[PDB]
Design a protein around this motif. Sequence first.
Motif, short mmCIF file in Angstrom:
data_model
loop_
_atom_site.label_atom_id
_atom_site.label_comp_id
_atom_site.label_asym_id
_atom_site.label_seq_id
_atom_site.Cartn_x
_atom_site.Cartn_y
_atom_site.Cartn_z
N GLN A 138 0.82 -1.20 0.00
CA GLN A 138 0.00 0.00 0.00
C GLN A 138 0.86 1.25 0.00
O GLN A 138 1.84 1.36 0.75
CB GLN A 138 -0.94 0.01 1.21
CG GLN A 138 -2.25 -0.71 0.97
CD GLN A 138 -3.13 -0.74 2.20
OE1 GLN A 138 -2.64 -0.84 3.32
NE2 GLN A 138 -4.44 -0.66 1.99
N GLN A 139 0.48 2.21 -0.85
CA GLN A 139 1.16 3.49 -0.95
C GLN A 139 0.28 4.65 -0.52
O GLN A 139 0.71 5.48 0.29
CB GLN A 139 1.64 3.71 -2.40
CG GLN A 139 2.47 2.57 -2.96
CD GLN A 139 3.78 2.38 -2.22
OE1 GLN A 139 4.45 3.35 -1.86
NE2 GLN A 139 4.15 1.12 -1.98
N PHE A 140 -0.93 4.74 -1.06
CA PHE A 140 -1.85 5.81 -0.70
C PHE A 140 -2.40 5.61 0.71
O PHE A 140 -2.44 4.49 1.23
CB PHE A 140 -3.02 5.87 -1.68
CG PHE A 140 -2.68 6.53 -2.98
CD1 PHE A 140 -3.50 6.34 -4.09
CD2 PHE A 140 -1.56 7.32 -3.11
CE1 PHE A 140 -3.20 6.94 -5.29
CE2 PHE A 140 -1.26 7.92 -4.32
CZ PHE A 140 -2.08 7.73 -5.41
N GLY A 141 -2.83 6.71 1.32
CA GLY A 141 -3.60 6.64 2.55
C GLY A 141 -4.78 7.58 2.45
O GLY A 141 -4.61 8.75 2.09
N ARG A 142 -5.98 7.11 2.77
CA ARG A 142 -7.18 7.91 2.57
C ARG A 142 -8.16 7.63 3.69
O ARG A 142 -8.39 6.48 4.06
CB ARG A 142 -7.81 7.59 1.22
CG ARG A 142 -8.80 8.61 0.72
CD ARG A 142 -9.07 8.41 -0.76
NE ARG A 142 -7.83 8.36 -1.53
CZ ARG A 142 -7.76 8.12 -2.83
NH1 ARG A 142 -8.85 7.90 -3.55
NH2 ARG A 142 -6.57 8.10 -3.42
N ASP A 143 -8.74 8.70 4.24
CA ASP A 143 -9.84 8.58 5.18
C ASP A 143 -11.15 8.61 4.41
O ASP A 143 -11.16 8.56 3.17
CB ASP A 143 -9.76 9.69 6.23
CG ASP A 143 -9.00 9.26 7.47
OD1 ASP A 143 -8.69 8.06 7.59
OD2 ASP A 143 -8.71 10.13 8.32
N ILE A 144 -12.28 8.70 5.10
CA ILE A 144 -13.55 8.75 4.38
C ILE A 144 -13.86 10.21 4.03
O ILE A 144 -14.76 10.84 4.60
CB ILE A 144 -14.67 8.06 5.18
CG1 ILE A 144 -15.94 7.89 4.34
CG2 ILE A 144 -14.89 8.71 6.57
CD1 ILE A 144 -16.95 6.95 4.95
N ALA A 145 -13.12 10.73 3.06
CA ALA A 145 -13.45 12.02 2.47
C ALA A 145 -13.10 12.09 0.99
O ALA A 145 -13.26 13.16 0.39
CB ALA A 145 -12.73 13.15 3.22
N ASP A 146 -12.62 11.00 0.38
CA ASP A 146 -11.99 11.03 -0.94
C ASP A 146 -10.78 11.96 -0.96
O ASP A 146 -10.40 12.47 -2.02
CB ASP A 146 -12.98 11.40 -2.04
CG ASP A 146 -14.15 10.45 -2.12
OD1 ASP A 146 -15.15 10.78 -2.80
OD2 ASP A 146 -14.08 9.36 -1.51
N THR A 147 -10.18 12.20 0.20
CA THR A 147 -9.03 13.08 0.34
C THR A 147 -7.86 12.31 0.91
O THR A 147 -8.02 11.56 1.88
CB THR A 147 -9.35 14.28 1.24
OG1 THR A 147 -9.58 13.82 2.58
CG2 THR A 147 -10.59 15.01 0.75
N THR A 148 -6.68 12.48 0.31
CA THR A 148 -5.49 11.82 0.80
C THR A 148 -5.12 12.35 2.18
O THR A 148 -5.12 13.56 2.41
CB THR A 148 -4.33 12.02 -0.17
OG1 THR A 148 -4.79 11.82 -1.51
CG2 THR A 148 -3.21 11.03 0.12
N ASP A 149 -4.80 11.44 3.10
CA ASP A 149 -4.41 11.80 4.45
C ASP A 149 -3.17 11.07 4.94
O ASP A 149 -2.76 11.29 6.08
CB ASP A 149 -5.57 11.55 5.43
CG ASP A 149 -5.56 12.50 6.61
OD1 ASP A 149 -5.26 13.69 6.41
OD2 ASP A 149 -5.84 12.05 7.74
N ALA A 150 -2.58 10.21 4.12
CA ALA A 150 -1.33 9.56 4.47
C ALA A 150 -0.64 9.13 3.18
O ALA A 150 -1.30 8.79 2.20
CB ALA A 150 -1.55 8.34 5.38
#
Lengths: 50, 36
Positions: free
Chosen positions: A12-24
């Motif tokens: 895994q490379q991307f990190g995403r919360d429930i906003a369709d916004t990158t957070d990690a």
Amino acid sequence: LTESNKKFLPFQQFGRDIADTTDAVRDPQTLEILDITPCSFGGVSVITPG
Amino acid sequence: YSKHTPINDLPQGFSALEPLVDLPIGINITRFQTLL
Ligand SMILES: *[C@@H]1O[C@H](CO)[C@@H](O)[C@H](O)[C@H]1NC(C)=O
Ligand SMILES: *[C@@H]1O[C@H](CO)[C@@H](O)[C@H](O)[C@H]1NC(C)=O
């Protein structure tokens, strides 16, 4: 980009919360997880006694 | 994508398949076969 306590899966490379916004993000060269907290902002109110 | 799980026969358990290979570009593949 501050250090984060999250632990990605090895692929895994991307990190995403429930906003369709990158957070990690997993850093490519050195393998670490960095937070993507947005730069501070906010309204500017003025208190005046008239 | 691959995953290896132990059992005692597709079990009723749940296991997600972790991606492992992203082989580069090819052309149309509409058929396949296994190397027995
Ligand atoms: C590339 O090699 C390893 C693999 O992640 C890493 O530790 C290293 O810091 C990277 N950069 C250099 C210059 O070796
Ligand atoms: C399969 O892909 C090729 C790419 O060269 C293209 O001709 C077409 O999308 C497909 N061929 C067919 C349907 O005969």
